[PDB]
């Protein structure tokens, strides 16, 4: 994992998006492409349409998934069996 001195990494795009989203206390679906951004306690209510490679899948954050990255909840490869 990332070193603690550098601190958590969040892209500026969705960071600004969530600051303007939470300043009026309503959470609309936020369409993002940055699967590398970690989850901050500022995301607890917001629903993210994280990219997958083909489409954007809705991700609703909770308390538990803080500290993970948005990409962990958008599975890329699809496998059903042989």
């Amino acid at each position: 994992p990332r070193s603690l001195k550098k601190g958590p990494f969040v892209d500026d795009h969705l960071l600004k998006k969530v600051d303007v989203q939470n300043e009026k206390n309503t959470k609309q679906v936020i369409k993002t492409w940055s699967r590398r951004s970690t989850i901050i306690p500022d995301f607890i209510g917001h629903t993210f349409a994280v990219h997958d490679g083909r489409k954007h899948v809705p991700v609703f954050v909770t308390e538990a998934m803080v500290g993970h990255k948005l990409g962990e909840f958008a599975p890329t490869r699809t496998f059903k069996g042989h």
Binding site: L4, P8, P41, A64, V66
Partner: peptide
């Protein structure tokens, strides 16, 4: 709670 652990790590 995970949020507490974040506060420990980064604060």
């Amino acid at each position: 709670g995970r949020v507490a652990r974040f506060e420990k790590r980064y604060g």
